[PDB]
Design a protein around this motif. Structure first.
Motif, short mmCIF file in Angstrom:
data_model
loop_
_atom_site.label_atom_id
_atom_site.label_comp_id
_atom_site.label_asym_id
_atom_site.label_seq_id
_atom_site.Cartn_x
_atom_site.Cartn_y
_atom_site.Cartn_z
N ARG A 60 -33.01 -42.73 21.91
CA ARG A 60 -32.85 -43.33 23.23
C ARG A 60 -32.46 -42.27 24.25
O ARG A 60 -31.62 -41.39 23.97
CB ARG A 60 -31.80 -44.44 23.18
CG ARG A 60 -32.18 -45.58 22.24
CD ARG A 60 -31.04 -46.57 22.06
NE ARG A 60 -30.90 -47.46 23.21
CZ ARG A 60 -31.57 -48.59 23.36
NH1 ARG A 60 -32.47 -48.96 22.45
NH2 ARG A 60 -31.36 -49.36 24.42
N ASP A 61 -33.01 -42.36 25.45
CA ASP A 61 -32.71 -41.34 26.46
C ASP A 61 -32.95 -41.96 27.83
O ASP A 61 -34.11 -42.21 28.19
CB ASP A 61 -33.59 -40.11 26.24
CG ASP A 61 -33.26 -38.95 27.20
OD1 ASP A 61 -32.44 -39.12 28.12
OD2 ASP A 61 -33.85 -37.86 27.02
N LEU A 62 -31.87 -42.22 28.58
CA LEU A 62 -32.02 -42.85 29.90
C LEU A 62 -32.76 -41.96 30.90
O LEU A 62 -33.34 -42.48 31.85
CB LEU A 62 -30.64 -43.23 30.45
CG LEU A 62 -29.94 -44.34 29.67
CD1 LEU A 62 -28.43 -44.44 29.96
CD2 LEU A 62 -30.67 -45.70 29.95
N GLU A 63 -32.77 -40.64 30.69
CA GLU A 63 -33.44 -39.69 31.57
C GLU A 63 -34.85 -39.36 31.10
O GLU A 63 -35.42 -38.35 31.52
CB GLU A 63 -32.60 -38.41 31.69
CG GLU A 63 -31.22 -38.65 32.27
CD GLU A 63 -31.23 -39.05 33.75
OE1 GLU A 63 -32.27 -38.86 34.45
OE2 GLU A 63 -30.19 -39.56 34.22
N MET A 64 -35.43 -40.21 30.25
CA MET A 64 -36.78 -40.02 29.75
C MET A 64 -37.51 -41.34 29.92
O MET A 64 -36.94 -42.39 29.64
CB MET A 64 -36.76 -39.60 28.25
CG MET A 64 -38.15 -39.30 27.65
SD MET A 64 -38.13 -39.07 25.85
CE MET A 64 -38.00 -40.76 25.28
N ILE A 65 -38.75 -41.29 30.39
CA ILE A 65 -39.54 -42.53 30.46
C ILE A 65 -40.32 -42.66 29.15
O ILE A 65 -40.72 -41.64 28.57
CB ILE A 65 -40.47 -42.57 31.68
CG1 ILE A 65 -41.48 -41.41 31.67
CG2 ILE A 65 -39.69 -42.58 33.00
CD1 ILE A 65 -42.58 -41.57 32.74
N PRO A 66 -40.59 -43.88 28.66
CA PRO A 66 -40.23 -45.16 29.28
C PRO A 66 -38.79 -45.58 29.00
O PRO A 66 -38.08 -44.95 28.21
CB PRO A 66 -41.22 -46.15 28.63
CG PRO A 66 -41.43 -45.58 27.25
CD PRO A 66 -41.40 -44.06 27.45
N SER A 67 -38.38 -46.66 29.64
CA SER A 67 -37.04 -47.20 29.49
C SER A 67 -36.92 -48.04 28.23
O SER A 67 -37.84 -48.79 27.88
CB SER A 67 -36.68 -48.06 30.70
OG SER A 67 -35.52 -48.83 30.46
N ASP A 68 -35.77 -47.94 27.56
CA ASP A 68 -35.48 -48.85 26.46
C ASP A 68 -35.30 -50.30 26.90
O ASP A 68 -35.12 -51.17 26.04
CB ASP A 68 -34.22 -48.37 25.70
CG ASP A 68 -34.52 -47.21 24.76
OD1 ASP A 68 -35.21 -47.43 23.74
OD2 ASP A 68 -34.08 -46.08 25.03
N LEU A 69 -35.32 -50.59 28.21
CA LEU A 69 -35.40 -51.99 28.64
C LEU A 69 -36.79 -52.57 28.44
O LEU A 69 -36.94 -53.80 28.49
CB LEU A 69 -35.00 -52.11 30.13
CG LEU A 69 -33.59 -51.63 30.47
CD1 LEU A 69 -33.40 -51.61 31.98
CD2 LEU A 69 -32.53 -52.51 29.80
NA NA Z 1 -35.88 -43.84 28.09
#
Ligand code: NA
Ligand code: NA
Ligand code: NA
Ligand code: NA
Lengths: 774, 803
Positions: A144-153
């Motif tokens: 998981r990485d919030l600064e990488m697309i796509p989002s885990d949402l």
């Molecule tokens: Na991400």
């Protein structure tokens, strides 16, 4: 000169302490001999099983692959290149102990030149212990990485591993890094222009080469050939510009392609490659529909994710061919390729089958990250356009999906999202102004892109499906070019509902409701001449991490095909509206027991493109009806008939006059008049056996033994002994935890030529057992 | 300070795997939303990532990141006080967050460390974000035991590099002025008749209070005062020497009479009175050149063991009660010395060694692999300094260890003996700069044996190499190589409940006279020269004789400092997937759940005076042999004389004599009758004027058995909701295969669950049979289940369990 590296790999879930652990000497039974690796064939995905396993969060983290490469370059002073069709999500590549390349992005193609590292390794003292082969070790990471697309949402798995083909490519000194075929077709369709541009790969800095450009038409006849003598094979070069009079046009019904063949010659090489393209004119009308080659074309669309039963993202070429053929046979002429760039095998299939394409970057929910996040979005957009530029199928580059969806960051800034969206839009137009940009569902960005899709889920997430035309009409007026991507509804395959039908004396997540929803949308589209088109979401059930409690856990069940390619009842609705090949399908092939009152007149639907159909119930004709799409439902091919308590045979015969063809369908259905109380017990039996596999059936019954035909209760399978459950397929009959479909559940068991006991559990009911002997 | 120190055990959640950023731990999340996955697991601390997967036979144990989160209710009772998170230990790399703010990080799984979170708590509680947390403070902690060649210990090591918050995490409220360090420097004069104590402290004083009144009190074993002094108006900032005092005729700390002093410090201002305490002891230790070890001027044979922080069901996350039980079990066995595995251990363990009288060797986890770069070296230096600073006051400690098997290569593509020597000498010098009252040591790195004070070679006679009758001669040769020799690690594996009528049966190819050191490949079950580790049946019968021999030899080695058996208790290790209990080092004399093995009583009979008596074979239900064969019966007892009775008939009195090997002369050769037999032993100890007895029952089987043909499965017993299931391997004629070691696999379908993954021979769903038998417990969950029992090439058998 391209070799798919599929065999002789090993896989390790989890990280190593450093590259040395992948290549160091290891004696049997030593400390170096753990962790234990798993032999695999590529393509491979970390999440082949745990994405749909009902009891675990799918794995998002590092994993490793290793192989031994046998190197034999046929070119003098040639190059050795690893060509990745795609790998998730962050990848690092090692030759022996040397880091040779890295990539961030799970869906674009990329490559690594390993020539120098291979030479250095083979010339070293360390090469002897590898016996002439070269060790290749690859780390993939879907952490998981919030600064990488796509989002885990997002509503799909962010998969990990070498899940698209990895190719070993031998090259001569001078080759092509990119070939761009810039083709345009005038509106009058009589003049085509082709500019042939290329980017050279020339690490040895060869100063001159002879380059031949030849263009062949759909029948492989030459229409142009020219040799450029002594051209500089460096950087970007325009090789040819030509006008083709009366070109053969690419069309969704008759897909025809031209071929450009390029040869690079030096005293030390003759290298030929080819690239296909097609001539076609596309136009979105202001506040109007879509035109292909000067004629209005209603886009008949679907979507797909790269995901399949048993393998997650690691689909083979044969699986892709089967899926795309199934789409074409359903009448599809348009596809949005999920939320990311897809395998080039898919794009080639769209070119060859006649399916127009919307392809987007996975900027999909969450807001907007920092500099690294933005750089990845720009890079993946450029890579997608550059890499897929030549496919005539592509008409839209998408910039993102549901970018109004917040909460990956502690701030949400609409203005920053708009500013970055316009930057991407402007960049797409600098790279390729012959195609339209688009997004889906971000109302505060709807003035930025060329083509806009809102969210319209009539009859599923909101409203009723009879609201579909009205919402579409309202939304099309808000933007210059409207195109509706995503609609439909979930159906638990093999679950049906009497409540959905107009029975004469509404079933959401049953197939019975979704066939009616699709039926309605398609007949409305026949009365919407202003409509560009739509794309149903999706073609095939696929896994998603955010739906643990779906009837099949962790599977989005809106497909018209099951995750293993089994068509649902909804597949035939589309086929009956969208194709000319005569077909006929009585609803209810997987509906074994209907129910109601003794004298009820039950609705029977037939989905058919035949001009007239006669229905028979227990051999007695119920009359001939003529097909009329606007006579909803089932385009007039519906009847209300009395079923006998017990077994019934329903038969339908149709004729299609243009084809002068007669077709028939037949199903058997039981009819139950007894009412049932709450679930009381699980009745478990061996339904059938085929070779080493047994098909086990569960039926929920009440305290009086009556089948609970409306039960959706979750059933859990367990096995002890020699056999194994055929589970974790993401299908309603391949799941060890699954909601009942009309009080029933099926699963297959691999008996392994031995003995087993199957246990069947359901909350609050006594556990049941079935002995399986061989 | 117990009043200020709060164990945070409840209301935690745990996530295996990483988050995309701290926002994922604290962001708003509605039920059924995308934020509601991944799903977290409620846990009680202490907790270890690997409580189950370390011994699960079918997976590699997890080495990677994981997260914990809780909501803290904060209420500091001190005016203008401090709020501190105090970690007893967490594996291996830890990062700490208060809301979205990173407040601390640590690399090292075995040293203690703390984080002052006062300002972050204040900033959070004053923010608009505090409202949604309802007065609580979100605390999120990332722990990571990913493999890392540039971090010690090495994954080449024979133990799990565990992950998680596996030692207590404490919330500590402090007043304005407190003590950051308390150092008690004690020394004991020539004649043991004069003791010197220096009391040094470092203050924690973030508010820069200029003056305080500090009281120093020293109490004896009864907590009655021997010294008290108040320093008025001292500067409570930085370092202060608080007291230096001479104690005439101090009470000495001893392994038989462990007596401790307590130093109690109080710091007072107009706004606070804060008291804390630290214990210490007076004792003189001396390693003689080429000679033995002296405690308080008398030779003491070190009777040693080891332990790992690892236990059934919990991996490293042992509770204080579990630690207390284990250490008491050691003391009751006669232990007076322990080497604490390969790393600093919980301070609870050190306090127990002080209280029980167990001398200590404690080392840093520089354990195999070679030598890494600057970060690796900085970690080793830091963990050495932390261990000495943190454990300096414990009188039990006599040795700071610098590493184990540092001659073991292959974490790097280079191995440089000179670089290893240079760093080893730097660590040795640092230890002596910090604490010149203790000895440094290492184990098994011959090219460094001139650097440290005390050296252990590898001597595994009768296990990894050679025969156990070479133990003394090998020890004689090895002790001559170094100034101070101390032998740590020896023993052998025993699959608990496995026994043998011929313990030496397949040990014919093993060669004597050529060393007993473990070399490369010996630990593996494949390849290598013949050795009991590979060729033995792994029975308790063999290890009991190996231990017996070692202990009786040590009575004739007057130059010997002592030894330490490896280990006290079975423990999990990632490098032994094929052991009879998968992933467990089974050399313990106690099982991983505290059940004593037969070897526990061998040590006890040699090392204790409290009268005891133990007939060998309590877990040996069926003996075998020919009709009228005279079967050997061994009794392990510290009694002066023992009489044996077989089926009520006296077999004569025998006198105990350690050198009359085996069983110190307490052995008989008696006929068993086919069927059941009762063996009774009565011993008397003249010094205590006490008589003790033991009794066992054993079946005797004369029928010979063919190869294994079937698994016979039965319900052996039940207790409440728990069922005890038994498997017996039989041949084609139904005869019990009493020598079978065949692996048995248990599966269950239905309401119940296997009580498995305990790392014990009766708590493993894949386990080798012990004399053709295998047991496992099932939690029935008040329902119905079917148990399946598999064995390679045999028909699978089934057992229904109804409630
Ligand atoms: Na991400
Ligand atoms: Na899952
Ligand atoms: Na394991
Ligand atoms: Na390490």
């Amino acid at each position: 000169n391209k070799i798919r590296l599929t065999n002789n790999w090993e896989y390790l879930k989890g990280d190593l302490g450093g590259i040395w652990e992948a290549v160091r000497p290891a004696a049997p039974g030593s400390s170096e001999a753990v962790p234990i690796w798993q032999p695999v064939t590529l393509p491979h995905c970390f999440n082949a099983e745990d994405a749909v396993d009902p009891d675990v969060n799918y794995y998002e983290g590092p994993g490793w692959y290793k192989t031994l490469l046998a190197i034999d370059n046929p070119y003098r002073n040639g190059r050795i290149v690893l060509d990745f069709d795609g790998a998730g999500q962050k990848t690092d590549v090692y030759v022996y102990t040397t880091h040779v390349g890295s990539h961030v992005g799970g869906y674009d193609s990329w490559n690594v030149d390993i020539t120098d590292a291979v030479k250095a390794f083979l010339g070293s003292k360390d090469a002897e212990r590898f016996k002439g082969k070269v060790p290749l070790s690859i780390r993939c990471d879907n952490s998981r990485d919030l600064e990488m697309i796509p989002s885990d949402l997002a509503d799909f798995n962010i998969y990990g591993g070498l899940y698209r083909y990895l190719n070993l490519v031998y090259l001569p000194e001078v080759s092509f890094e990119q070939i761009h075929l810039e083709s345009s077709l005038s509106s009058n369709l009589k003049e085509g222009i082709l500019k042939v541009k290329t980017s050279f790969y020339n690490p040895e800095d060869i100063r001159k080469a002879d380059v031949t450009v030849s263009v062949y038409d759909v029948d492989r006849k030459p229409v142009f050939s020219k040799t450029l003598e002594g051209i500089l094979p460096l950087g970007d070069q325009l090789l040819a510009k030509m006008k083709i009079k009366n070109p053969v046009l690419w069309d969704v019904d008759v897909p025809q392609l031209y071929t450009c063949e390029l040869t690079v010659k030096t005293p030390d090489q003759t290298f030929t490659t080819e690239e296909r393209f097609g001539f076609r004119h596309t136009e979105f009308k202001d506040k109007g529909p879509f035109f292909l080659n000067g004629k209005r074309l209603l886009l008949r669309g679907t979507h797909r994710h790269e995901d399949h039963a048993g393998v997650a993202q690691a689909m083979t070429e044969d699986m892709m061919r089967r899926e795309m053929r199934m789409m074409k046979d359903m009448g599809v002429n348009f596809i949005r390729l999920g939320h990311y760039q897809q395998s080039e095998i898919i794009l080639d299939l769209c070119d060859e089958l006649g399916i127009l394409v919307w392809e987007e970057i996975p900027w999909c929910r969450g807001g907007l990250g920092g500099d690294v996040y933005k750089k990845q979005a720009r890079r993946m957009l450029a890579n997608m356009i550059v890499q897929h530029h030549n496919h005539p199928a592509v008409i839209i580059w998408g910039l993102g999906n549901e970018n109004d969806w917040p909460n990956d960051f502690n701030t949400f800034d609409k203005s920053a999202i708009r500013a970055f969206m316009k930057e991407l839009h402007d960049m797409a137009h600098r790279l390729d102004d012959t195609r339209m940009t688009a997004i889906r569902r971000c109302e505060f960005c709807n003035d930025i892109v060329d083509v806009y899709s809102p969210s319209i889920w009539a009859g599923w997430y909101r409203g009723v499906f009879t609201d579909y035309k009205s919402i579409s009409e309202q939304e099309m007026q808000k933007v210059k070019h409207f195109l509706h991507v995503e609609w439909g509804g979930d159906s638990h395959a093999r679950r049906h509902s009497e409540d959905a039908f107009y029975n004469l004396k509404d079933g959401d997540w049953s197939e019975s409701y979704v066939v009616r929803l699709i039926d309605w949308h398609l007949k409305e589209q026949e009365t919407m001449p202003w409509l560009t088109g739509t794309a149903y979401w999706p073609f095939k059930d696929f896994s998603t991490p955010v739906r643990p409690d779906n009837p099949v856990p962790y599977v989005n069940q809106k497909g018209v095909v099951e995750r293993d390619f089994t068509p649902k009842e909804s597949y035939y609705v589309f086929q009956s509206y969208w194709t000319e090949k005569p077909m006929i399908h009585i609803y209810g092939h997987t509906w074994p027991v209907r129910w109601g009152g003794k004298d009820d007149r039950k609705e029977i639907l037939v989905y058919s493109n035949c001009d007239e159909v006669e229905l028979f119930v227990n051999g007695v004709s119920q009359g001939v009806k003529r097909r009329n799409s606007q006579d909803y439902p089932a385009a007039g091919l519906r009847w209300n008939c009395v079923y006998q308590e017990g077994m019934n045979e329903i038969r339908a015969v149709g004729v299609k006059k243009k084809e002068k063809k007669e077709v028939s369908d037949v199903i058997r259905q039981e009819y139950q008049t007894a009412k049932w109380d709450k679930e009381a017990a699980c009745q478990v039996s061996l339904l059938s056996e085929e070779g080493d596999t047994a098909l086990v059936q569960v039926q929920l019954i009440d305290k009086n033994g009556i089948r609970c035909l409306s039960s959706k209760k979750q059933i859990t399978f367990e096995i002890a002994g020699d056999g194994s459950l055929i589970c974790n397929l993401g299908t309603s009959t391949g799941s060890r935890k699954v909601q009942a479909y009309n009080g029933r559940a099926l699963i297959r068991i691999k008996r392994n030529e031995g003995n087993s006991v199957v246990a069947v559990k359901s909350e609050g009911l006594p556990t049941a057992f079935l002995e399986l002997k061989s």
